[PDB]
Design a protein around this nucleic acid. Structure first.
Ligand code: ZN
Lengths: 49, 49, 49, 43, 126, 149, 159
RNA sequence: GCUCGUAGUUGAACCU
RNA sequence: AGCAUUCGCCAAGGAUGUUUUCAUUAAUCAGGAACGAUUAGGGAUCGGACGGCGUUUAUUUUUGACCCGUUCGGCACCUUACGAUAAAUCAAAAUGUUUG
């Protein structure tokens, strides 16, 4: 997972090269931190909103 | 005591970072966050309901 | 210094118009360089010279 | 969204030009695009 | 002619903050600018700077910065009327600061009242 | 594509200013802490997401570093230095229980897996090694003539 | 003249006399030169450093020869770093002290950066074209400059 | 129609 | 307002580059006068300077035409406005809805 300076989370694989899925809302401003939970199912997003 | 529904903070957050001052004054932690549960996030019908 | 090439250029344009006094756009070049004579003669007179 | 779509289109066209003049300025093996990350390596 | 190096530099901060840039390049430097960035950096609204002379000021900035101020008529301000001036400049008094030119240095208005000095309003930033 | 609904939700009423550092407990799964741009750190539980478990105005500018220790305690870096907090105490202590400022402008922070040790990325181009409960000042390791943050 | 010379200032002047007789095949700065001034302070610990000073307008007179002159000085005296420096009587004074420290390659650019507080560090970039012994002596240039003038600088080749 | 131009107007930084 | 054959002469002027200098001379306009801070880059346009993992001039060195890169300086197109706002005007009417 990567959190962008603009309004997007990028879901990648280890061996992908291009983004498996992308995440955005209108209410999420600038994602500064993005980390997993400790089962690998959910992803957790701290933004500038 | 002023109460601010999550429809209202939802609409202020949907309005872009032009209004980041109005959001940062709207999330005053003094105030009663009145959590609503209905699908719309439409403030005028939440308030009249 | 600069002022001698200014008066060489300016009196040269004056001699050109004294060869033909009907070239009015070169007469405008004369009033440009004469305006520079008023300018740098004024400022470099107020330096002390 | 709209701004991310526009800006990644602008990045596509800009990298298209930069690789175009990269190939012309080459023209007048290669180095791999993963090898064009490590600038230097100190001991 | 734009002799206002501060108004130019802070137009660069404003427009290259709404742009979504992540560092600006300000080649006309000063000491009012560097001390202005000392204050804003001390309150964390710009990330970092670095001056590399030829007078380049490179400002790694963060992103929360709403608006940095452009007051040209730098007025004297009483310490008793400074509440009126700060409540006219800042959109909310707990958000942002007002850059004061004092004889004890240049600092925010809250630290200016921590040192009990009245000065001159030059800036605001929030 | 039809059932791509990725958004679960929101950890309660959130912070006031933007969340600029957050961390997770590698031993738990639901201890989520996040420090915004007021210094105020908050601690949530992922089961109980309508409200935060703990809340303190920890620093003044922002919270740069944030991590959990191996026992239950957290750690925060800011420009004001670094504080060690007990988020889980039955007398709920809003006051910190350790601090460090010998160093410099600490700009991030990370914690060891097994043994009680953490390092902080400073502003002097250095990282500090603290081994908890028997270290006053951390060991300093830096690249020898290194200047940048 | 100005100084009552030390035993090691007359060891340096003794090396100057040893570059007046039984030597090269060159004397453009070796034939007129007398004693001026010298100091000698450690580079950290382990080895010391030797500096001499300059009568101010004669810096082109010390640009008569300095290449291989400091090589003869480092051979014949104490195997330590030998450095020339101009003492004067502050801005362009100490900037000129820096440009007299690093004499072959001139300064490219002063990079005084700050950290996320009031702190700030000066670090000036020097041109790449001479690096071989300069990466050795660059610590000595920095710590000589803070041990003598007083402020905190570091030097770097740019990237 | 445009241009030069004066009073006026605003006057680079740098130096306990 | 305008500027269209060739050639000569007369002076200006622009642009580039320099290893050039008195060093504030600067910037905008009442009184008056002659003539009638970035957009965000891409692809093209020339006017230079530098370079060539290329042809041709060339009997081979100059040299020039073509192709490429950097680079400035301008005349316009296109989208998004970085925004605006009085709209019909826009890469400027961007800075008249958190005005300094
Ligand atoms: Zn509702």
């Amino acid at each position: 997972v990567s959190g962008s300076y603009d309004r997007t989370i990028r879901l990648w694989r280890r061996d992908a090269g291009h983004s498996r899925d992308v995440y955005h809302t209108k209410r999420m401003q600038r994602v500064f931190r993005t980390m997993w939970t400790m089962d690998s199912k959910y992803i957790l997003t701290g933004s500038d909103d | 005591n002023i109460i601010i529904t999550s429809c209202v903070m939802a609409e202020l957050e949907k309005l872009g970072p032009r209004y980041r001052v109005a959001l940062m004054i709207a999330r005053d932690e003094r105030w009663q966050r009145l959590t609503c549960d209905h699908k719309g996030t439409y403030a005028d019908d939440c308030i009249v309901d | 210094e600069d002022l001698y090439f200014l008066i060489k250029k300016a009196v040269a344009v004056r001699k050109h118009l004294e060869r033909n006094r009907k070239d009015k756009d070169s007469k405008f070049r004369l009033i440009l360089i004469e305006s520079r004579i008023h300018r740098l003669a004024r400022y470099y007179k107020t330096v002390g010279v | 969204p709209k701004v991310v779509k526009k800006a990644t289109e602008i990045k596509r066209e800009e990298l298209a030009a930069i690789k175009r003049r990269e190939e012309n300025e080459r023209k007048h093996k290669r180095k791999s695009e993963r090898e064009k990350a490590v600038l230097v390596k100190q001991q | 002619v734009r002799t206002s190096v501060l108004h130019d530099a802070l137009n660069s901060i404003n427009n290259a903050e709404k742009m979504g840039k992540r560092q600006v390049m300000i080649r006309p430097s000063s000491k009012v600018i560097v001390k202005f960035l000392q204050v804003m950096q001390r309150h964390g609204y710009i990330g970092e700077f670095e001056e590399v002379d030829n007078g380049k000021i490179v400002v790694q900035l963060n992103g929360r910065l709403n608006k940095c101020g452009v007051i040209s008529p730098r007025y004297n301000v009483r310490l008793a009327e400074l509440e009126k001036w700060v409540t006219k400049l800042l959109p909310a008094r707990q958000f942002g600061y007002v850059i004061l030119t004092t004889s004890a240095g240049i600092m925010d208005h809250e630290e200016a009242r921590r040192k009990h000095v009245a000065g001159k309003i030059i800036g605001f930033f929030y | 594509r039809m059932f791509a609904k990725p958004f679960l939700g929101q950890l309660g009423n959130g912070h006031v200013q933007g969340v600029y550092s957050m961390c997770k407990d590698k031993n738990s799964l639901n201890c989520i802490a996040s420090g915004s741009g007021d210094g105020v750190v908050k601690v949530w539980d992922l089961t109980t997401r309508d409200e935060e478990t703990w809340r303190v105005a920890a620093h003044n500018n922002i919270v740069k570093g944030l991590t959990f220790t191996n026992d239950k305690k957290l750690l925060s870096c800011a420009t004001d230095g670094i504080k060690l907090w007990d988020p889980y105490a039955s007398p709920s202590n809003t006051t910190p229980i350790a601090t460090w400022q010998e160093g410099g402008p600490y700009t991030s922070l990370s914690f060891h897996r097994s043994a009680n040790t953490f390092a902080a990325s400073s502003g002097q181009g250095c990282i500090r090694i603290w081994d908890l409960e028997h270290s006053t000042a951390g060991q300093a390791i830096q690249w020898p003539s290194f200047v940048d943050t | 003249s100005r100084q009552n010379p030390s035993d090691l200032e007359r060891a340096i002047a003794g090396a100057l006399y040893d570059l007046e007789t039984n030597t090269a095949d060159l004397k453009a700065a070796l034939r007129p030169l007398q004693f001026v001034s010298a100091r000698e302070i450690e580079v950290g610990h382990g080895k010391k450093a030797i500096v001499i000073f300059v009568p101010v307008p004669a810096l082109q007179g010390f640009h008569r020869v300095q290449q291989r002159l400091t090589r003869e000085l480092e051979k014949k005296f104490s195997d330590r770093h030998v450095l020339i420096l101009a003492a004067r009587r502050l801005t362009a004074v100490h900037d000129a002290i820096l440009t007299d420290l690093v004499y072959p390659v001139e300064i490219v650019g002063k990079r005084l950066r700050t950290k996320e507080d009031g702190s700030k560090v000066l670090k000036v970039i020097l041109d790449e074209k001479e690096r071989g012994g300069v990466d050795y002596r660059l610590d000595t240039y920095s710590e000589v400059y803070r041990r003598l003038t007083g402020r905190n600088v570091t030097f770097e080749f740019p990237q």
